[model samples]
Target: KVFGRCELAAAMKRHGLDNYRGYSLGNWVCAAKFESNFNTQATNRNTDGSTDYGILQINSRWWCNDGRTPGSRNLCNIPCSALLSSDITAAVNCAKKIVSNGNGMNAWVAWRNRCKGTDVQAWIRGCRL
Candidate 1:
């Protein structure tokens, strides 16, 4: 079980660590695992009508905040179906950016710290490469 989800594997294969805009998949996965378990279609109900989309559980609002582009999506004002129909890699990459902006392990250092007691963090740490 090197990777629990196919979408995550695809995202990693498509956008290696160095190519990653944010932290490497290794670093971001820790929080991702904690967030949505790597489910690409995962969605959460936002306080408003907005929704969190993709593997990293990105809120549509944040998507708009980052500025939508070819590979990007505006989930805040966009519909979940629209996001689901878009590129999974772009969506994952977008969320990866948000997490890896130093908040990846920084925010998860405590919650994911428990997983650090075993090989999980070791595996995730390797992704920083």
Candidate 2:
């Protein structure tokens, strides 16, 4: 379930990923673009033994319980596999909670280098919400 940039933006905004929560819509779009490019089934495993899952690559270390990571807190109280849903509803919901839980958008490691300080409005300008 890879998404068009605008459509992905629409979904995130639908879940309230906005400046009100200290993140611009641009950054959200930017993160998805570079992180996993709106791939609903993306997966990555870190050498440290935690896995990253889904569109925004929510990690097993803190957000989900994969039953494999050594110190998973599962703060989102969700199964890591839920992040792989084609609908992205679970991913977005957990993403909102990720920020609400005080982790902020910095949860994605690529943010500081790729999404930061950029005008990402064009990434989602054509999106119809």
Q: In terms of lDDT, which candidate is strongest?
A: 2
Model 2 lowest lDDT segment of ten: 13-22
Q: Estimate, for each residue in 18-70, the C-alpha lDDT of model 1 and write its tens digit.
A: 33543444455555576666556666765655556555556655464323233
Winner by TM-score: 2
**Candidate 2 lDDT over residue span 1-129, tens digit each:** 898887777777877776737788878888887888778789999999999998889999998999999878998899999999877778878888887766677777787678777776767786786
- As for model 2, its CA RMSD to the true structure in angstroms is 1.6
* TM values, all candidates: 0.52, 0.90
Report the Cα lDDT for candidate 2.
Answer: 0.83
C-alpha-based local distance difference test score of model 1: 0.50
Clashing pairs in 2: none
Query: How many clashes in each candidate?
Result: 4, 0
